[PDB]
Each structure stands twice: as structure tokens, then as C-alpha cells.
Symmetry: C2
Subunit: 40 residues, 2 copies
């Protein structure tokens, strides 16, 4: 049904947003750490 499609896509967006923000947070930190280590 339509309600099903609406609700499942809501859930998919919620899950994916949370996972991608974690991926971004870790990648930004690793990039910064690598950059800081190259200083010395």
C-alpha cells in the first residue's frame, strides 16, 4: 500500500541518515588526525 511505501521510506531515510553521519564523523576525525600527525 501507499501508507506502507511512505512509512518504509521514512524509516530508510532515518536509518541511512544516522549511518552516514557516523561514517562522516569518523572520516572527518581520521582526516584531521592524519593531517595533525604529518605536522611532526
Amino acid at each position: 500500500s501507499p501508507e506502507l511505501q511512505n512509512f518504509l521510506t521514512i524509516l530508510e531515510k532515518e536509518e541511512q541518515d544516522k549511518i552516514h553521519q557516523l561514517q562522516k564523523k569518523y572520516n572527518k576525525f581520521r582526516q584531521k588526525l592524519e593531517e595533525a600527525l604529518r605536522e611532526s
Copy 2:
């Protein structure tokens, strides 16, 4: 080099992947039960 760095990062990677799997597990269950709840509504 740098083994020191990589040893740290591998621990970080496991923490990250554990969090991601934990999220995936939760949302997979949520998906299942959401589908059930809708049918039975």
C-alpha cells in the same frame, strides 16, 4: 610506519563498524515489525 597509528585506527574501525551494525540490526527489526503493524491495521 606507522604501525602505531594503524593499530589505533583498527580499534576505531571496530568501534565504528559495531555501531553501524547495531543500528542496522535495530532498523531491520523495526522494518519487520512496522510491516506487520501496518498489515494488521
